[PDB]
Design a protein around this ligand. Sequence first.
Ligand SMILES: [Zn+2]
Length: 44
Amino acid sequence: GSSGSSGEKPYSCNECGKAFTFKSQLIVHKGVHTGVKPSGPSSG
Ligand SMILES: [Zn+2]
């Protein structure tokens, strides 16, 4: 369980909190928050 050390990442989450080297990587992790259902955009 070696997880923690982090250098520098211009992409970090705000909802739950996290870091990412590339945007895409962050977009995927963000999907867990935004729209927690396949039922398209909850609101709009
Ligand atoms: Zn997050």
